[PDB]
Design an enzyme around this catalytic site. Structure first.
Site, PDB file in Angstrom:
ATOM      1  CG  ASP A 137      -1.860   1.116   1.324  1.00 47.41           C
ATOM      2  OD1 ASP A 137      -1.859   1.977   0.426  1.00 47.41           O
ATOM      3  OD2 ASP A 137      -2.611   1.158   2.322  1.00 47.41           O
ATOM      4  CB  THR A 138       1.884   3.600  -2.740  1.00 47.85           C
ATOM      5  OG1 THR A 138       0.626   3.732  -3.421  1.00 47.85           O
ATOM      6  CG2 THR A 138       2.734   2.533  -3.438  1.00 47.85           C
ATOM      7  N   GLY A 139      -0.347   4.161  -0.249  1.00 45.02           N
ATOM      8  CA  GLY A 139      -1.116   5.199   0.421  1.00 45.02           C
ATOM      9  C   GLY A 139      -0.932   5.199   1.932  1.00 45.02           C
TER      10      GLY A 139
HETATM   11  C1  LIG Z   1      -3.467   2.138   6.519  1.00 43.55           C
HETATM   12  C2  LIG Z   1      -2.556   2.893   7.467  1.00 43.55           C
HETATM   13  C3  LIG Z   1      -1.373   2.248   7.911  1.00 43.55           C
HETATM   14  C4  LIG Z   1      -0.482   2.900   8.795  1.00 43.55           C
HETATM   15  C5  LIG Z   1      -0.759   4.206   9.252  1.00 43.55           C
HETATM   16  C6  LIG Z   1      -1.932   4.864   8.822  1.00 43.55           C
HETATM   17  C7  LIG Z   1      -2.842   4.226   7.935  1.00 43.55           C
HETATM   18  C8  LIG Z   1      -4.071   4.987   7.520  1.00 43.55           C
HETATM   19  N1  LIG Z   1      -3.972   5.449   6.146  1.00 43.55           N
HETATM   20  C9  LIG Z   1      -4.963   5.197   5.265  1.00 43.55           C
HETATM   21  O1  LIG Z   1      -5.994   4.581   5.520  1.00 43.55           O
HETATM   22  C10 LIG Z   1      -4.707   5.754   3.845  1.00 43.55           C
HETATM   23  N2  LIG Z   1      -5.478   4.863   2.932  1.00 43.55           N
HETATM   24  C11 LIG Z   1      -4.824   3.803   2.353  1.00 43.55           C
HETATM   25  O2  LIG Z   1      -3.645   3.519   2.573  1.00 43.55           O
HETATM   26  C12 LIG Z   1      -5.615   2.942   1.342  1.00 43.55           C
HETATM   27  O3  LIG Z   1      -4.705   2.223   0.547  1.00 43.55           O
HETATM   28  C13 LIG Z   1      -6.564   1.944   2.027  1.00 43.55           C
HETATM   29  C14 LIG Z   1      -5.908   0.622   2.517  1.00 43.55           C
HETATM   30  C15 LIG Z   1      -6.936  -0.318   3.105  1.00 43.55           C
HETATM   31  C16 LIG Z   1      -7.353  -1.453   2.356  1.00 43.55           C
HETATM   32  C17 LIG Z   1      -8.322  -2.345   2.878  1.00 43.55           C
HETATM   33  C18 LIG Z   1      -8.881  -2.106   4.156  1.00 43.55           C
HETATM   34  C19 LIG Z   1      -8.470  -0.974   4.910  1.00 43.55           C
HETATM   35  C20 LIG Z   1      -7.503  -0.087   4.384  1.00 43.55           C
HETATM   36  N3  LIG Z   1      -7.616   1.615   1.076  1.00 43.55           N
HETATM   37  C21 LIG Z   1      -8.857   2.198   1.085  1.00 43.55           C
HETATM   38  O4  LIG Z   1      -9.153   3.095   1.881  1.00 43.55           O
HETATM   39  C22 LIG Z   1      -9.806   1.672   0.078  1.00 43.55           C
HETATM   40  C23 LIG Z   1     -10.049   0.265   0.050  1.00 43.55           C
HETATM   41  C24 LIG Z   1     -10.950  -0.301  -0.877  1.00 43.55           C
HETATM   42  C25 LIG Z   1     -11.621   0.527  -1.790  1.00 43.55           C
HETATM   43  C26 LIG Z   1     -11.397   1.919  -1.784  1.00 43.55           C
HETATM   44  O5  LIG Z   1     -12.068   2.698  -2.687  1.00 43.55           O
HETATM   45  C27 LIG Z   1     -10.493   2.522  -0.860  1.00 43.55           C
HETATM   46  C28 LIG Z   1     -10.292   4.030  -0.901  1.00 43.55           C
HETATM   47  C29 LIG Z   1      -6.400   5.686   2.091  1.00 43.55           C
HETATM   48  S1  LIG Z   1      -6.856   7.080   3.113  1.00 43.55           S
HETATM   49  C30 LIG Z   1      -5.157   7.247   3.625  1.00 43.55           C
HETATM   50  C31 LIG Z   1      -4.358   7.963   2.511  1.00 43.55           C
HETATM   51  C32 LIG Z   1      -5.126   8.097   4.920  1.00 43.55           C
END
Ligand SMILES: Cc1ccccc1CNC(=O)[C@H]1N(C(=O)[C@@H](O)[C@H](Cc2ccccc2)NC(=O)c2cccc(O)c2C)CSC1(C)C
Lengths: 99, 99
Positions: A25-27
């Site tokens: 996950d690059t996000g």
């Molecule tokens: C995930 C994580 C790990 C460590 C520290 C903070 C965080 C929180 N960050 C985040 O959540 C970031 N997100 C991420 O990193 C995303 O890649 C996220 C990962 C994920 C996948 C499946 C279950 C739950 C999460 N995916 C989604 O939110 C997601 C999943 C499925 C469909 C869809 O349309 C979306 C937008 C998108 S919003 C964001 C940029 C803030």
């Protein structure tokens, strides 16, 4: 390796002596894994994104192996819906986005 | 180009004739953008993030440019932390993960 994004980029990782499937996950700024036992002390933390926030425990200097590459870094443990490998570890294995 | 992950992979996109900052997110299946005005009809969609599931508006065949690369696809609009460029568009512009 070159991974396409037609489907979720899931890989097998080894952490804390067990095998798990995780999403590249690059996000994600950091790495969060489902509840599991890890060594060392930990500190409470909140992480949030789509849908809100969840509470996790922060463990440092945790060793992980992903696709044969060994990396070290902080690992968060909590009620995440999916095991996620974030940038803090992606950088360590030389992972980049290309287009 | 080749983007490293030491910092968030933020890029400039153009949608609705306006420039906006967005995150290249391989962990997101869809592209989610902050509240704005898109043309046409929309339909219901539930997406699951780190904090849980939320309702968003789905617009199809939306013109959007990513770091100069033109694309046309599904854009979801709703309460998001940042503008997220998900796999549906990353794949369209030929983006892959590499290490
Ligand atoms: C995930 C994580 C790990 C460590 C520290 C903070 C965080 C929180 N960050 C985040 O959540 C970031 N997100 C991420 O990193 C995303 O890649 C996220 C990962 C994920 C996948 C499946 C279950 C739950 C999460 N995916 C989604 O939110 C997601 C999943 C499925 C469909 C869809 O349309 C979306 C937008 C998108 S919003 C964001 C940029 C803030």
């Amino acid at each position: 390796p070159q991974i396409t994004l037609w489907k979720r980029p899931l890989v097998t990782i080894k952490i804390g002596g067990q095998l798990k499937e995780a999403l590249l996950d690059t996000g994600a700024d950091d790495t969060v894994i489902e509840e599991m036992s890890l060594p060392g002390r930990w500190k409470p933390k909140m992480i949030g994104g789509i849908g809100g926030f969840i509470k996790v425990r922060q463990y440092d200097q945790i060793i992980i192996e992903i696709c044969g590459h060994k990396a070290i870094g902080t690992v968060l443990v909590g009620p995440t819906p999916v095991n996620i490998i974030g940038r803090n570890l992606l950088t360590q294995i030389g992972c980049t986005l290309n287009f």
